[PDB]
Amino acid sequence: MKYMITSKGDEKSDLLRLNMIAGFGEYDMEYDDVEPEIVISIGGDGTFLSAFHQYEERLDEIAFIGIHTGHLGFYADWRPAEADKLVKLLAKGEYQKVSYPLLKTTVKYGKEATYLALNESTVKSSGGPFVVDVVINDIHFERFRGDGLCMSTPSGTTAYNKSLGGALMHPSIEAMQLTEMASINNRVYRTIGSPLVFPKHHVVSLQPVNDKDFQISVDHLSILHRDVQEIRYEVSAKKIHFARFRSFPFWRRVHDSFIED
Amino acid sequence: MKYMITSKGDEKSDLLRLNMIAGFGEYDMEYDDVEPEIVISIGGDGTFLSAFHQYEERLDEIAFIGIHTGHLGFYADWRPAEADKLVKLLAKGEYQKVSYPLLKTTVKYGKEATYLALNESTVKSSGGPFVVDVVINDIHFERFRGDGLCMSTPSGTTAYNKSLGGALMHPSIEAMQLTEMASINNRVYRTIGSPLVFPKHHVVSLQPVNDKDFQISVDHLSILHRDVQEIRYEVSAKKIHFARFRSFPFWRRVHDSFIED
Amino acid sequence: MKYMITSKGDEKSDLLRLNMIAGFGEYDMEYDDVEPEIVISIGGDGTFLSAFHQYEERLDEIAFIGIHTGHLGFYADWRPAEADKLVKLLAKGEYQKVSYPLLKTTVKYGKEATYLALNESTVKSSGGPFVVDVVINDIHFERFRGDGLCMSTPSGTTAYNKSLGGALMHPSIEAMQLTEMASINNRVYRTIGSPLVFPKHHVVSLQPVNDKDFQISVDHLSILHRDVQEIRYEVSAKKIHFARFRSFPFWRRVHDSFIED
Amino acid sequence: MKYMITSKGDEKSDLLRLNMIAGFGEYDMEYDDVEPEIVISIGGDGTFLSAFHQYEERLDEIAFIGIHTGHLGFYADWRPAEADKLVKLLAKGEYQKVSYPLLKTTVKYGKEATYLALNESTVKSSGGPFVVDVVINDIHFERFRGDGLCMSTPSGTTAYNKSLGGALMHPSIEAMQLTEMASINNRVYRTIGSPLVFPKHHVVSLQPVNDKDFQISVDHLSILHRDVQEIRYEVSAKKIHFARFRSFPFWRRVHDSFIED
Numbered sequence A, B, C, D: 001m002k003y004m005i006t007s008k009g010d011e012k013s014d015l016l017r018l019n020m021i022a023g024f025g026e027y028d029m030e031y032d033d034v035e036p037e038i039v040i041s042i043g044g045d046g047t048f049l050s051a052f053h054q055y056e057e058r059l060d061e062i063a064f065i066g067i068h069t070g071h072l073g074f075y076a077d078w079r080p081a082e083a084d085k086l087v088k089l090l091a092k093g094e095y096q097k098v099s100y101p102l103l104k105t106t107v108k109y110g111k112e113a114t115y116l117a118l119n120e121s122t123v124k125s126s127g128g129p130f131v132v133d134v135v136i137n138d139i140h141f142e143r144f145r146g147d148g149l150c151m152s153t154p155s156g157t158t159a160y161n162k163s164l165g166g167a168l169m170h171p172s173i174e175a176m177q178l179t180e181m182a183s184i185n186n187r188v189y190r191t192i193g194s195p196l197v198f199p200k201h202h203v204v205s206l207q208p209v210n211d212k213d214f215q216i217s218v219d220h221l222s223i224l225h226r227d228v229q230e231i232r233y234e235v236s237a238k239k240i241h242f243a244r245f246r247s248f249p250f251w252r253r254v255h256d257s258f259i260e261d
C-alpha cells in the first residue's frame, strides 16, 4: 500500500532507506509521506519517537515498523540485515497488528492544549522550586515538592520511568505509571514515594501551589508553559499500531536490552 | 442471608462480634460459618487475611467485609462505630459487589500443590544462598541470586511489595507484580532490578539452580518446601468479592494509610 | 564581641532580631556586620545558607548560630522562645565551638572559579542530554548519562542527597558523598548506581563528553556555566564553626526532623 | 618469615598453593599455620573471609594477601598468573601494609559474646516478625519493623550493603554503615529509610520489643541467638592489615568489579 520511510539522517540509515525504497519499487508499493499506511523508522528509539509524533493524527490508519541501525531499541526491533526479508513480507501483507497504549496530556491555561506521548510526559519547575498538588479522580492525594513527576506509558516504563525506580510494565495493560523525581519528605512534606499505576479512565491532575510556570516534556519535546492552571494525565483512547511479522515478546526485548543479548 | 463473623480474639473485637450477631438476630439473617454468603472480619488486615483463607474454596459465593478495631486496614475499611449502620445495610441487601484479582501459586515436586494469595507470595532459601532461574512464558529472563522474590496481587502492592520498592497498583488491573529482595549485581550476576508487572495469562516460573529447598510464603502462611522443581505464578481465574456499601476509593484508602488520615 | 544578625525578612524574624539586638545592648556586645565574630541566623535553613555564604571569606573567625522561627532546621536548631537565654549565654562566652566539613567546587574554563558549599553542589545539563565522564583521583571511573550528579557535605546528606537515595552521614566524618540523578543503565550505558563516599584529599572530577554547558548549583545558588572543561570536587580545607551551648546531637536532630518531634 | 596458605579446596587453588609453598622453600620462608605473619588466601572472597576469621585473634601480627582463582574479588585482588612474582616480592619483604576498619558486634543475654566482622553483621527474626528499637549513643532513634538490619564495614559496603541500597564507602574512613531490609512505613510504623553512616566511638544498640530470638549473621557465620537483650555495633579498635605490593586503588577495584574490567 502507501508507505514512507524516515531516517536517522546518518550515512548508514539513509542508504538503507534508499535500498528499501528500491526494493519496494518491485511491488505494488507506493511511496507517500502524506497518507502512508506503513511508516518505517530507520535509526534509534529517538528516530522512532519522531516518526510517531510525525503522524500522530493518523495513528488508526498507520502501522509502524522500527529498524535499528545502531543498537536494539524497544521500538526499532529489526536488524538492518533483515531489511530485504522485511520488504518482501511487508509487500505481501496479511500481517498481524499489535497495539500499545498511549498517554494523553492536557494543559489548561487562563485555551487548553493536548499532547500524545509514546514514552512519557514529565513536569518540572521553570527555575525555582517545584510544588504541585496531586489530584486523582477529583480527590486530593498529596502535595508534591521535589524535582518533578513522570507519567509513563507501558512501553515507556523501560525508559525514563525505569531510571526513576518505576516498575516495568507489559504493554497489553492499558494503564499509566507515575513516578517521583527527588521528592522531599521531612516533617512538613510528605509524598507516597512509591510509583503509582493507574488504569483506564483514571484522571491524574496536577495543580500549581505558587509558581504557575512549568517545563513540561512530552517524549523528546520540552516546552515552557506559562500561566498553567492544570495538567491532566489519562490513558488515551488512541493507540499506536505496530506491524508485527514474527514473535518478539516484550519481556524478551527487555531481557536483550538490559540483561544480555 | 447466611453469614459469619470472625474476630481478632481481643476484648474489643469479640464483643463487637457479639453485638453484631445480636443485631442480625432482628432480621432474616442466619449465622452459618460453614456456607456463609457474607463473611465479616473484625480486627486487622491479618484477621482479614485469615478470614479469606478460611473460605478460599467458596470465594464466588461469598462477599467479604472488613471492620478495623485497631487502625484502618486496606481490607478492614469500616470503623467500629459504624457497625449498627452496617448491620442494617447488610440485612436489606441489594448492595454492589467489588472484585479484586488474586495470585495463583503452584509448587511442583518430584504431587504439585496450589495456593491462593490475597497479598503476595514470596520465595526464600532454606538457609544457604538463594539462586533461581526466572522463566517468563517459557522464556529464560534472568538468573536471580539474592534474598528472595515477591509476587504481589494489586491489593498486595501496598504491603510487602511496597517495602521492596514496588509500585502501587489499582486493583481494577488484573495483574501481578514481581519485586526483588536484595539482588546481587556484579560482574557475574545480573538481574533486571526493576519491579515487573505481568498481565493475565502470563506465567512466571522459578526453577532451582542448586539447592532445591525453599521457604515459600503465601500471605501469612510460610512453609518449607523440599525437592522443589518449579514455582509457577499467574493471575488466578478466581477473584475475591467485597461487599461495598459506600464510596471508599482505593487511592483515598492509600492516602489515608500512608499520607495522612 | 562583634556580632551580627540576619533575618528571614518576615514579621516574626525581624522583631526577634530587634529584640536580641536590644538585649545585646545590655552587654559588651557590638553590632558589626562587616567583621562579626558571631553570626546569628533567624529563619529557616535557607536563611542560614544565605548567612553562611554571606561570610564565607571569614569562616575561621566566625561562629554561626541558627534560630528557627518556622520549623526545626538542621542548621537553625534554636527555638525563638529561647532567644533571651541565648543572648545571656552568648554574651558571657567561653562556649564550645563545633566544626562541620565543607565542599570545595572548582570550575575550569578555556580563568577557573571556586565555590564553597555547606549543603551540596549539583551539575545538570543546559537543555539537552547530560553526559559526563567521572574521574576519581585521575582514574576514569564511569561515563554518567542522566539528569545530573549531586555532591553533598556530611550535613548536606539530610538534604538533597537524602531525596536521591543517599546515605545520612555524621558531620564528624570529613568526607563528601556523590549521588546520581536518574542515571541511564542499559546495554550501552553503565553507572555504579550506588552513592559514593569520598574521604579527604580524594578529588572527583567531571569532564564533558559533548555539550560543554552545565547548570551548576552551589546550595541555593545556580549558575549556567559555559565552555566548561572540568568540575572538581573535594573536601575543603575550610570548615564552618557553630557556637554550641547545649547538647543537641546530630542523630537526635535527624530523629526530630524525619521520625518525630 | 612465618606464613601459611589457605585454599578454596578446588583443583586449581590446591595446586597453586602447592606451587607457592615450593617457591617459598627457596627462600627464608617457614610454613606455619599457627603463628603466621603472612596469610595467603587462594580462592574467592568467601575463602578470604574464612582466612580472616581463622586468624582474627592475631590480626595485628598478620598481613593478609588474597589471590582470586575465579573472578576478581575485593579481597582476593591478585591474579593466579602473578603468583611467582608474588612469591619473590613477598620473600624479600619491606612492603607497605594497608589497614581496613572492622565491625565489632556484641550480643548480651540474660554472658555476652563479641564478634568481629570484615564485611557486615545482620539481624533477622527467628520466624515471626522482626521488631527492634534502634538506640544511637543511648538515644532512642527509631522503632524498626521489617526483614532486618545490616551493619557494614567500609570494605563491606560493596557487598550485602550495596544490594540494600547502601552507599559505597572508602576504607580509609573509620566508620560503619547501617541499612534497612524491607522496612515497614505506614501510619503506625516509621523508620529513617536512608542508610546511616556512623563514625568511631558511636554505639548503635538494637533492643528487642517482643520476640527475643534473632538470627544474627557475622559475614558468612549465621547463628540463632536466644534470650537476647541487646545487640551493640561499633567500629572496632582492631583493624585488618593487607600486604600491598602495587597500587590497586579501591575505586579502581570498584570500577573493575561493577562497571567493567
Ligand SMILES: Nc1ncnc2c1ncn2[C@@H]1O[C@H](CNCC#Cc2nc3c(N)ncnc3n2[C@@H]2O[C@H](CO)[C@@H](O)[C@H]2O)[C@@H](O)[C@H]1O
Binding pocket: A044, A045, A046, A047, A049, A073, A074, A119, A120, A155, A156, A157, A158, A159, A160, A161, A163, A219, A220, C145, C146, C147, C181, C182, C183, C184, C186
Ligand atoms: N534521565 C533519563 N533517564 C532515562 N531516560 C531518560 C532520561 N531522560 C530522558 N530519558 C528518555 O529519553 C527519551 C528520549 N530519547 C529517545 C529515546 C528513547 C528510549 N525509549 C526507550 C524505551 N521506551 N525503552 C527503553 N529505552 C528507551 N529509550 C532509550 O532511551 C535512552 C535515552 O534516550 C536511549 O538508550 C534510548 O534508546 C525520553 O522519552 C525518556 O524516556
Ligand SMILES: Nc1ncnc2c1ncn2[C@@H]1O[C@H](CNCC#Cc2nc3c(N)ncnc3n2[C@@H]2O[C@H](CO)[C@@H](O)[C@H]2O)[C@@H](O)[C@H]1O
Binding pocket: B044, B045, B046, B047, B049, B073, B074, B119, B120, B155, B156, B157, B158, B159, B160, B161, B163, B219, B220, D145, D146, D147, D181, D182, D183, D184, D186
Ligand atoms: N518486611 C515486610 N514489610 C512489609 N510488609 C511485610 C513485611 N513482611 C511481611 N509483610 C506483610 O505482612 C503481611 C502479613 N500480615 C498481615 C497484613 C497485612 C497488610 N496487608 C496490607 C495491604 N494489603 N496493604 C497495606 N498494608 C497491609 N498490611 C499491613 O501490613 C503490615 C504488616 O503486617 C500491617 O500494617 C498490616 O496492616 C504479609 O502478607 C506481607 O504483606
Ligand SMILES: Nc1ncnc2c1ncn2[C@@H]1O[C@H](CNCC#Cc2nc3c(N)ncnc3n2[C@@H]2O[C@H](CO)[C@@H](O)[C@H]2O)[C@@H](O)[C@H]1O
Binding pocket: A145, A146, A147, A181, A182, A183, A184, A186, C044, C045, C046, C047, C049, C073, C074, C119, C120, C155, C156, C157, C158, C159, C160, C161, C163, C219, C220
Ligand atoms: N529536590 C530536592 N529534594 C530535596 N532537597 C532539595 C531538592 N532540591 C533542593 N533541595 C535542597 O534545597 C536546598 C536549598 N533550600 C534551603 C535549605 C535547606 C535544607 N537543608 C537541609 C539540610 N541540610 N538537612 C535537611 N534539610 C535541609 N533543608 C531543607 O530543605 C528543604 C528544602 O529546601 C527544606 O525543608 C529545608 O529546611 C538545597 O541546598 C538542597 O539541599
Ligand SMILES: Nc1ncnc2c1ncn2[C@@H]1O[C@H](CNCC#Cc2nc3c(N)ncnc3n2[C@@H]2O[C@H](CO)[C@@H](O)[C@H]2O)[C@@H](O)[C@H]1O
Binding pocket: B145, B146, B147, B181, B182, B183, B184, B186, D044, D045, D046, D047, D049, D073, D074, D119, D120, D155, D156, D157, D158, D159, D160, D161, D163, D219, D220
Ligand atoms: N543478598 C545478598 N546480596 C548481596 N550480598 C550478599 C547477600 N547475601 C549475602 N551477601 C554477602 O555474602 C557474603 C558472603 N559470601 C562471600 C563473600 C563476599 C563478598 N564480599 C564482597 C565485598 N566485600 N565486596 C564485594 N563483593 C563481595 N563479595 C561477593 O559477594 C558475592 C556474594 O557472596 C560474591 O560475588 C562475592 O564475591 C556476605 O558477607 C554478604 O556480604
